[PDB]
Design a protein around this motif. Sequence first.
Motif, short mmCIF file in Angstrom:
data_model
loop_
_atom_site.label_atom_id
_atom_site.label_comp_id
_atom_site.label_asym_id
_atom_site.label_seq_id
_atom_site.Cartn_x
_atom_site.Cartn_y
_atom_site.Cartn_z
N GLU A 110 0.82 -1.21 0.00
CA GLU A 110 0.00 0.00 0.00
C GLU A 110 0.85 1.26 0.00
O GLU A 110 0.36 2.33 -0.38
N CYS A 111 2.12 1.15 0.39
CA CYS A 111 3.06 2.27 0.39
C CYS A 111 3.83 2.40 -0.90
O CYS A 111 4.55 3.39 -1.07
N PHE A 157 11.27 5.32 -0.10
CA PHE A 157 9.85 5.61 -0.29
C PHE A 157 9.63 7.11 -0.45
O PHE A 157 8.75 7.52 -1.21
C1 LIG Z 1 1.95 3.34 3.14
C2 LIG Z 1 2.62 4.71 3.00
O1 LIG Z 1 2.55 5.32 1.98
N1 LIG Z 1 3.32 5.22 4.16
C3 LIG Z 1 4.06 6.47 4.22
C4 LIG Z 1 3.98 7.29 5.34
C5 LIG Z 1 4.71 8.46 5.40
C6 LIG Z 1 5.55 8.81 4.34
O2 LIG Z 1 6.29 9.99 4.40
C7 LIG Z 1 7.51 9.84 5.07
C8 LIG Z 1 5.64 7.99 3.23
CL1 LIG Z 1 6.71 8.42 1.87
C9 LIG Z 1 4.91 6.82 3.17
#
Ligand SMILES: *CC(=O)Nc1ccc(OC)c(Cl)c1
Length: 162
Positions: A59-60, A162
């Motif tokens: 999901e991320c 990410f």
């Molecule tokens: C599942 C998801 O996208 N989590 C997430 C939370 C917070 C951030 O920013 C640091 C990111 Cl890139 C992804």
Amino acid sequence: DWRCARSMHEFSAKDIDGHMVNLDKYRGFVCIVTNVASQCGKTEVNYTQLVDLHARYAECGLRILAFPCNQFGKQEPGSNEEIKEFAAGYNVKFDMFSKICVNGDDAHPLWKWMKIQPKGILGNAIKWNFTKFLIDKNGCVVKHYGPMEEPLVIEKDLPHYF
Ligand SMILES: *CC(=O)Nc1ccc(OC)c(Cl)c1
């Protein structure tokens, strides 16, 4: 030529159902690319932990590209249909590809290219089943994890990409 590629996204590969997949569809996603086998002593831990990483981080934007390969102890001897069923037994929901070679002149060009991402010319051959490359959202190789590294070792490195 594959040597001059800048990104995983320039490559294509046949999925395990036989359909060509343009890998630029992974632009914007963080990817684990791994060579898999069904009859390896590492099979259980690797499938289980890859499925766990995908369950919690898909999901991320985490994607996993799994390439079967019979070059290491002949531990992926089955057909692509048999391999697809094997992965279903582990509740795999990430992306399964058709069986390839990862070493040799007939190796898939994506694998030829990943192996030379930094360094020296000698000794870059894939050594066994379940090598893992970590790919950033621009398609660059950012980490390599050897077949001794369990997939959950990767989790701590994911936030940087990410
Ligand atoms: C599942 C998801 O996208 N989590 C997430 C939370 C917070 C951030 O920013 C640091 C990111 Cl890139 C992804």
